[PDB]
Amino acid sequence: GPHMATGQDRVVALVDMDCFFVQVEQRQNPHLRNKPCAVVQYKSWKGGGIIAVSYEARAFGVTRSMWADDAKKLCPDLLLAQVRESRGKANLTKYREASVEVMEIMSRFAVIERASIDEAYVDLTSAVQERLQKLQGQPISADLLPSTYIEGLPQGQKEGMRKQGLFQWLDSLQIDNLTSPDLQLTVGAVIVEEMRAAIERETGFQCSAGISHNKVLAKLACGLNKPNRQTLVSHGSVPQLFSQMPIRKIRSLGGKLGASVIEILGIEYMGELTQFTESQLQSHFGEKNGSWLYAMCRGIEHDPVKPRQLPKTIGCSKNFPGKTALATREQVQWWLLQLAQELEERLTKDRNDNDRVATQLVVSIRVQGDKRLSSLRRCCALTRYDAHKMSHDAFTVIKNCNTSGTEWSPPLTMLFLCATKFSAS
């Protein structure tokens, strides 16, 4: 009763860009706007691999991971934009720079945690408290929430339903109680509307957002009404929402651990987890996972929004599939150099922009035949931003993987260089 926490202490949002790389290319090239279109990497093999897909193209069944040649069979008028290639490899600079544009706008509203190239969590608890004091007991108008859905409502056309639900929600709010979690979430949603409007005004990019009491629910909420909408998931919405929510839809449960929860417990939906004790869950999934599941299935999570706007590592990777695997010393050294040159460029820019220097270089390879993604992953000192030195050091750290009696055996199917362990500069 009175002593059981309900995980309603924070307001957390997750903002995620809609079909991000596609919007970057559509801003650049107006001919692609409002069209079925996709972003691809490479072009020779089956037209290139798709990494982002506009919503118009998704209506035809185009998805990420599809070869463009196959996507064209589903959507003959599909337009394509190709990722830049530099030094023989895909170069994602344009998208990293566009991400910085968006993150810098979001950071004006609150401290953000960069969760990926196109999404960030926001802890709005303080901003909501400030806005609630500003409002001075004033009711919140539906006009302040023009793109907000309230999950679970209405109860008891698309835009018509959205407005019905929002009206039910606002009608039910206790505006004069500044500690009401539902009121706090609603003010959070007002702020997120302002943030999303700022992003669109200042970059041209549209996005979706989730507003809830924690990161997992905010992330889940964000996807419920993509694109170009935001969704509020209240604590009270959790039992119904989770009662038919596949376990795999919750962040971190989309892989092996989620599969094991389903198999071991004989359940399908997140809400079914409430029928196990914390000790039972810890017994099957470990102390950490068990406690996390016990709270999460009740809508409770405590993972903080970490104050981190910049990536913690800077890496460069290339696969060499099938017959393109690297089989000569000259090939291996040339490609290590290419990767190191891109890495040097990004590191030098990072040092100038962000007042830090990486101190460790991680080298990873895969050998043809090896079932593992990586055959070797070894570190060495990163003491100077110099591509020839980094490539020589990477070769030094991997040369013993070569069985060859000038020849490289087994052929290499992947090279990877990653700068880590940043210090202030």
Add this chain to the structure above:
DNA sequence: ATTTTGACGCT
């Protein structure tokens, strides 16, 4: 022969 990343957990 989707690829190119990037955060975090385990031992």
